[PDB]
Amino acid sequence: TELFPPNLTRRYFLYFKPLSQNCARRYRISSKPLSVRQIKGDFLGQLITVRGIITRVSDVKPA
């Protein structure tokens, strides 16, 4: 007897989406478009957005 590990029956994913609207100017940041240059500090293990230019597109492979 072995129960299902929870990863078997999902057939779905999760996603997230931050904010940079006047709700940040309502009352209180985590979604200012910081560049790549100033990012090496305590920003490791967080949620940060960065703008850029996408290069080196690989293909789609099954994991």
Partner: protein
């Protein structure tokens, strides 16, 4: 430790006068960094010890 720790502690009472002029400095640099971070709507921990405060009276 008593031999390798004793002149630590005797210095631990000694250098506190060698930041009479910096014990203001080390807290003034953070109190606004604590302030602005609470009202956003930034400096590292630099404690410049000069020679002069450690050569005039400790040999």
């Amino acid at each position: 430790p008593d031999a390798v720790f004793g002149d630590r502690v005797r210095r631990f009472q000694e250098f506190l006068d060698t930041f009479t002029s910096y014990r203001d400095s080390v807290r003034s640099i953070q109190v606004y960094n604590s302030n602005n971070a609470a009202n956003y709507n930034i400096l590292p921990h630099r404690i410049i010890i000069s020679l002069d405060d450690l050569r005039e009276f400790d040999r």
